[PDB]
Design a binder for this molecule. Structure first.
Ligand SMILES: [Mg+2]
Lengths: 13, 316
């Protein structure tokens, strides 16, 4: 769940 | 400046005195005789507040000063060694090696200057690592971190290879000692770096200059990802979110470099005729490709993430 949140930060444009 | 410590001739004289005292201690020890390190300790001027820049800090501007440091440590006790580390961290911005290794203060270092940086790295950091790994408790490590954060512009220290590696050593050591004082001190360090994390990656014009002087085909940035891995490992989720956001463009630039190397590998490996030189080329490409994967995964794995099969995904 922590990893999912950080992965979402990588998806920022 | 050397004049802020007494001048060049005074510091060179202090180094000669230090060597004489070490040679005496080493000779006495070798002959199996009693040793007294008082004269050597006094010749170092650590407790000397008489100058703007401490004479010990200026002695570290010379290779001779740097090279005698492991031998000095053979004749000192724990509190004397701790006083040296305290001095180094307290006056870290006044350390010539920091100014030389910062892309901001030294954008075009000469080969002679790069050799001095590599020497300081090899000798001084190995001593700090060994001493903290063996002779330091929680209070003492916390003390050194506070000395760094309170007496220096932390963001400036991160523009230096030596500065960055010294911070990584302190963070990594603090993390091994297991609401805590460490959580509080980590957050104070995090505050001094926030919005400036990207500045740890030097400009391309700087990388080119170093690569040309050292015959490097790729700039070694393993120490940057090692710092980011230690910073992320001691941080909560909100710290990690900020770190990832601030270096996102650096993560993508590394992936692009790794993918360019993978394409080159594919294109060259399919060639029918393969001389010894082409085999050397392929081995060089594979080595540099795997290096980028490993350096980036050191940072990513710490946050439960992994770069594998051309994508960043969740680990386990
Ligand atoms: Mg003592």
């Amino acid at each position: 769940s922590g990893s999912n949140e950080l992965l979402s930060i990588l998806h920022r444009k | 400046n050397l004049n802020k410590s007494g001048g060049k001739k005074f510091i060179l004289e202090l180094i000669e005195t230090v060597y004489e005292e070490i040679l005496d201690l080493e000779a006495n020890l070798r002959n199996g005789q009693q040793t007294d390190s008082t004269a050597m300790w006094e010749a170092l001027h650590i407790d000397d507040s008489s100058y703007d820049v401490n004479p010990f800090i200026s002695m570290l501007s010379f290779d001779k000063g740097i090279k005698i440091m492991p031998r000095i440590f053979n004749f000192l006790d724990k509190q004397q060694k701790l006083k040296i580390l305290q001095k180094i961290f307290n006056e870290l911005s006044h350390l010539q090696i920091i100014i030389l290794s910062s892309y901001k203060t030294t954008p075009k270092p000469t080969l002679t200057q790069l050799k001095k940086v590599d020497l300081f790295q090899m000798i001084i950091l190995k001593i700090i690592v060994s001493f903290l790994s063996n002779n330091s408790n929680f209070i003492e490590i916390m003390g050194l971190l506070l000395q760094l954060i309170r007496n220096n512009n932390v963001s400036f220290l991160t523009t230096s290879k030596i500065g960055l590696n010294l911070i990584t050593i302190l963070i990594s050591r603090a993390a091994l000692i297991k609401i805590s004082t460490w959580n509080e001190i980590y957050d104070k360090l995090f505050t001094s770096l926030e919005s400036k994390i990207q500045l740890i990656f030097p400009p391309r014009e700087y990388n080119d200059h170093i690569m040309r002087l050292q015959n490097d085909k790729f700039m070694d940035e393993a120490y940057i990802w090692a710092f980011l891995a230690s910073l992320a490992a001691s941080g909560k989720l909100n710290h990690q979110r900020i770190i990832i956001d601030e270096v996102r463009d650096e993560i993508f630039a590394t992936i692009n470099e790794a993918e360019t190397l993978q394409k080159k590998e594919k294109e060259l490996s399919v060639l029918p005729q393969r001389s010894q030189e082409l085999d050397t080329e392929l081995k060089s490409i594979i080595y540099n490709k795997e290096k980028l994967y490993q350096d980036l995964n050191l940072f990513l794995n710490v946050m439960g993430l992994v770069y594998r099969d051309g994508e960043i995904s969740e680990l386990k």
